[PDB]
Paper text:
Drosophila melanogaster α-amylase, DMA, which belongs to the glycoside hydrolase family 13, sub family 15, has been studied from an evolutionary, biochemical, and structural point of view. Indeed, plant produced inhibitors are an important element of the plant defense response to insect predation against feeding. α-Amylases (α-1,4-glucan-4-glucanohydrolase, EC 3.2.1.1) belong to the glycoside hydrolase family 13 (GH13) as classified in the CAZy database, and catalyze the hydrolysis of starch and related α-1,4-linked glycosyl polysaccharides. As reported for other α-amylases from mammals, insect, plants, fungi, archaea and bacterial α-amylases, the enzyme consists of three distinct domains, A (residues 1 to 97 and 160 to 379), B (residues 98 to 159) and C (residues 380 to 476).
Domain B is characterized by its high variability in α-amylases depending on the origin, and as in other reported structures it is flanked by β3 and α3, and participates in binding a conserved calcium ion (here substituted with strontium due to crystallization conditions) at the interface with domain A. This metal ion contributes to the enzyme’s structural integrity. Domain C in the C-terminal part of the protein is composed of an eight-stranded anti-parallel β-sheet. Apart from the above mentioned conserved structural calcium ion, a chloride ion is located in the vicinity of the active site and a second non-conserved and highly solvated metal ion was identified in the electron density. In DMA the conserved calcium ion is coordinated by three water molecules, and residues from domain A (Asn98 OD1, Arg147 O, Asp156 OD1 and Asp156 OD2) and from domain B His190 O. Arg147 belongs to a well conserved motif and is present in more than 300 known animal Amy sequences, but not in Caenorhabditis elegans (Lys), nor in the paralog Amyrel present in true flies (Muscomorpha), which has a glutamine instead. In the DMA three-dimensional structure a chloride anion is present and is coordinated by Arg184 and Asn286 and Arg325. The non-conserved metal ion which has been identified in the electron density is highly solvated, being ligated to six water molecules, and performs only one direct coordination bond to the enzyme Gln263 which is weakly conserved, even within Drosphila. Apart from this direct coordination, the only contact this ion has with DMA is via a water molecule to Asp391, a residue which is conserved in all Drosophila except D. pseudoobscura.
Residue numbers in the entry: 1 to 476
Write the structure that this text describes.
């Protein structure tokens, strides 16, 4: 429940927001696999309610547990898991069993129909007896009202009923048979941990046919928003699985936006109020946080602030704390707007340029050179500890991961021109933020490390990038 089940020597979970299964399987073999990524988080794979203008949040109003979405059907989803597992990329499913669709959602994405006014869902065989009595969440400080009342009209299921427990376990076991490696449980704060423990304990072992070790259990990351000093604590859930550490997203936004100083990052971890490292799923932004009014509000860094979003992603991928997750979104100017379509419904596949960058309505942050080359940085340093910390007392910091990698940041209004201790063997290194290694040359900046371990690091305060990075797996 705490082991990621990652393949050997890989790191980084990519949330391919609203991608279809066919496009995900191709991206596993063409990019994610040969670039060292560890896993992919998919949108809900079960049938959801069809709503006007096809908003993104329609996929969190389940109609049934049939694998029938705009992303594809069960046959395409199963082939996607098999093809991604063959290149070493695991699959983690966003699962929604706290509620069903609200009023106005009579049609499903796979042919099923429902009647939320009577709490009747013929696809799951669900009846009104399987739900909590109708009530609305208004207080948010009453831990009983948050877990038993209806969230924005969504029909609150009763996870204490043995029939509901059967259907959820039946659905999660079906996904395990298809080769899935873990689950992201949506709205976990609105459910009782005692009932979650029963569901989690009944799940079968992982399918060894997909290259899983015998005795492997499904990875469990729980979506809990705990900004500190709340009625519901994240410690209620850290005993049953990993949690979404949203303090990481809100703090990393404040720091790299200038609202806090970079020198304070010297004790990044539980000293900043985070959960345990082996219990923390960390990220810069998520599909909710990037739209505002999330857990971090306006302080969250998104792709729309590219220079500081890349610096924040580079710091997270270089720090040993937690399990990093990188967001891959589609461009939006309206928080309700859904993914790009070829008409008004059929999701349009992403297209790629000579950059290996995305187009056609998708941003593809995981294909940014500054992001996927830092994933290689994480894979090259392993479990090496932080050493050689330096800072100027403001917004210029640098540290090394053992003797295998070095990174430097400049968030001040003036340049960085210092001879810093790098901790690496002497030689010539390619700046992995500004380029890559090709044969015996560097695409971007070059970094020369002297016999004393010191190197000249230069990051102008007006350059497009505010971070430099080098590691031993990109020498010469
Ligand atoms: Cl999340
Ligand atoms: Sr609930
Ligand atoms: Sr200080």
């Amino acid at each position: 429940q705490f082991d990621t089940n990652y393949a050997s020597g890989r790191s980084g979970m990519v949330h391919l927001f609203e991608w279809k299964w066919d496009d995900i399987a191709a991206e596993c073999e063409n990019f994610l696999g040969p670039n060292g990524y560890a896993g992919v988080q998919v949108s809900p794979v079960n049938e959801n309610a069809v709503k006007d203008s096809r908003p993104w949040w329609e996929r969190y109003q389940p109609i049934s547990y049939k694998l029938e979405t705009r992303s594809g059907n069960e046959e395409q989803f199963a082939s996607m898991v098999k093809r991604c597992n063959a290149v070493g990329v695991r699959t983690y499913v966003d699962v929604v069993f706290n509620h069903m669709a609200a009023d106005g959602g009579t049609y499903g994405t796979g042919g099923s129909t429902a009647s939320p006014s009577s709490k009747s869902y013929p696809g799951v065989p669900y009846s009104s007896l399987d739900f909590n009595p109708t009530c609305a969440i208004s207080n948010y400080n009453d831990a009983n009202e948050v877990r038993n009342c209806e969230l924005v009209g969504l029909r609150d299921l009763n996870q204490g009923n043995s029939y509901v427990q059967d259907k959820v376990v039946e659905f999660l076991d079906h996904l395990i048979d298809l080769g899935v490696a873990g689950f992201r449980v949506d709205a976990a704060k609105h459910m009782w941990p005692a009932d979650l423990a029963v569901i989690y304990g009944r799940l079968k072992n992982l399918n060894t046919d997909h290259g899983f070790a015998s005795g492997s259990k499904a990875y469990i990351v729980q979506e809990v928003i705990d900004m500190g000093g709340e009625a519901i604590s994240k410690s209620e859930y850290t005993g049953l699985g990993a949690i979404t550490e949203f303090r990481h997203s809100d703090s990393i936004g404040k720091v790299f936006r200038g609202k806090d100083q970079l020198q304070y990052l010297t004790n990044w971890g539980t000293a900043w109020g985070f959960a345990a490292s082996d219990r923390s799923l960390v990220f810069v932004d998520n599909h909710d946080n990037q739209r505002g009014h999330g857990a971090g509000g306006a302080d969250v860094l998104t792709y729309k602030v590219p220079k500081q979003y890349k610096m924040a992603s580079a710091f997270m991928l270089a720090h040993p704390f937690g399990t990093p997750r990188v967001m891959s979104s589609f461009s939006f100017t309206d928080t309700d707007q859904g993914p790009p379509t070829t008409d008004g419904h059929n999701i349009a596949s992403p297209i790629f340029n000579s950059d290996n960058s995305c187009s056609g309505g998708w941003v593809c942050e995981h294909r940014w050179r500054q992001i996927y080359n830092m994933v290689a940085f994480r894979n090259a340093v392993g479990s090496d500890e932080i050493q050689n910390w330096w800072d100027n007392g403001s917004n210029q910091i640098s540290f090394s991961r053992g003797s295998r990698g070095f990174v430097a940041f400049n968030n001040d209004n003036y340049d960085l021109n210092s001879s810093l201790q790098t901790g690496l063997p002497a030689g010539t290194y390619c700046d992995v933020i500004s380029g890559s290694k090709s044969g015996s040359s560097c695409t971007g900046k070059t970094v020369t490390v002297g016999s004393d371990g010191r190197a000249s690091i230069n990051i102008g305060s007006s350059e497009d990038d505010g971070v430099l990075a080098i590691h031993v797996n990109a020498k010469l």
